[PDB]
Amino acid sequence: KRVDFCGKGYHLMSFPQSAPHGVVFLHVTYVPAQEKNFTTAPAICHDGKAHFPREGVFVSNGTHWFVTQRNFYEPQIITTDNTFVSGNCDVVIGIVNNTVYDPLQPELD
Amino acid sequence: AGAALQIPFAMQMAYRFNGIGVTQNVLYENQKLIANQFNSAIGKIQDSL
Numbered sequence: 001k002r003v004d005f006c007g008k009g010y011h012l013m014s015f016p017q018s019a020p021h022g023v024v025f026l027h028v029t030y031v032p033a034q035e036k037n038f039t040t041a042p043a044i045c046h047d048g049k050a051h052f053p054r055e056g057v058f059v060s061n062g063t064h065w066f067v068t069q070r071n072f073y074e075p076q077i078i079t080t081d082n083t084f085v086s087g088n089c090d091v092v093i094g095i096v097n098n099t100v101y102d103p104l105q106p107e108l109d
Numbered sequence: 110a111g112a113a114l115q116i117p118f119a120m121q122m123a124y125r126f127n128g129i130g131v132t133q134n135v136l137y138e139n140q141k142l143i144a145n146q147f148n149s150a151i152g153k154i155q156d157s158l
């Protein structure tokens with residue numbers, strides 16, 4: 001996890017080869033590509049409660065809000081298993097209104 | 110690690126709080142105090158210099 005100790009990018013793995021009086025390291029790394037821009041927010045307010053992502057960031061495609069993982073764009077809908085709650089929505093700078101979906105009660109019809 | 114991708118600075122500070130074991134609500138609920146403390150700490154360096 002040391003930055004730039006094993007090449008440029010996120011180190012995946014490395015292979016050694018012998019040279020005359022030396023060694024050659026072939027570093028395999030992961031390099032992110034083809035980014036898009038989005039709107040973002042730190043928390044989400046629902047029922048007077050602030051919701052934070054468990055892992056990921058809240059992003060908006062223009063009209064809807066999703067959670068994604070931070071390094072590869074893979075959007076999902078914001079549920080109570082995606083997030084955790086802390087406090088009320090009066091203290092966070094930049095909080096946004098949206099609905100956080102519960103699975104249990106629409107299972108219970 | 111590649112191309113520069115923008116992110117707002119308080120959200121970068123929250124990632125970094127996660128990286129030491131503190132949840133990020135602890136940053137967002139203290140943002141103003143944390144920024145005051147950083148500013149006083151930076152203002153103390155030029156005084157010693």
Ligand SMILES: *[C@@H]1O[C@H](CO)[C@@H](O[C@@H]2O[C@H](CO)[C@@H](O)[C@H](O)[C@H]2NC(C)=O)[C@H](O)[C@H]1NC(C)=O
Nearest residue numbers: 038059060061062063064065066075076077078
């Ligand atoms: C943002 O993504 C959503 C996808 O959830 C698009 O909204 C539509 O949402 C309904 C119900 O959620 C789906 O049945 C549709 O298939 C979605 N797409 C369309 C084209 O109707 C929404 O269009 C996206 N917004 C932008 C600006 O890209």
Ligand SMILES: *[C@@H]1O[C@H](CO)[C@@H](O[C@@H]2O[C@H](CO)[C@@H](O)[C@H](O)[C@H]2NC(C)=O)[C@H](O)[C@H]1NC(C)=O
Nearest residue numbers: 040041042043092093094095096117118119120
């Ligand atoms: C990001 O910065 C913009 C300014 O560029 C903020 O927008 C202003 O919001 C205030 C309310 O606090 C309004 O009175 C101003 O009229 C807005 N200005 C513009 C140019 O839109 C925005 O609130 C900031 N975002 C956050 C999360 O603080």
Ligand SMILES: *[C@@H]1O[C@H](CO)[C@@H](O[C@@H]2O[C@H](CO)[C@@H](O)[C@H](O)[C@H]2NC(C)=O)[C@H](O)[C@H]1NC(C)=O
Nearest residue numbers: 044045046047048049089090094095096097098
């Ligand atoms: C997000 O939703 C909340 C919930 O209603 C909004 O809070 C209201 O804000 C208006 C204007 O600031 C007040 O007149 C109401 O009294 C508030 N309602 C409650 C129940 O407190 C909040 O304004 C919404 N945020 C945005 C940006 O529209």
Ligand SMILES: *[C@@H]1O[C@H](CO)[C@@H](O[C@@H]2O[C@H](CO)[C@@H](O)[C@H](O)[C@H]2NC(C)=O)[C@H](O)[C@H]1NC(C)=O
Nearest residue numbers: 138139140141142143144145146147148149150
């Ligand atoms: C955590 O520590 C900080 C000290 O940096 C406290 O904030 C200070 O509180 C004193 C009260 O004695 C104020 O006079 C200062 O102005 C505060 N500093 C800043 C930068 O706001 C804070 O109260 C402490 N929190 C708790 C829960 O004890």
Ligand SMILES: *[C@@H]1O[C@H](CO)[C@@H](O)[C@H](O)[C@H]1NC(C)=O
Nearest residue numbers: 033034035036037038114115
């Ligand atoms: C994102 O938008 C900015 C302008 O706000 C633009 O300069 C940048 O090239 C865009 N990047 C992508 C991936 O769309």
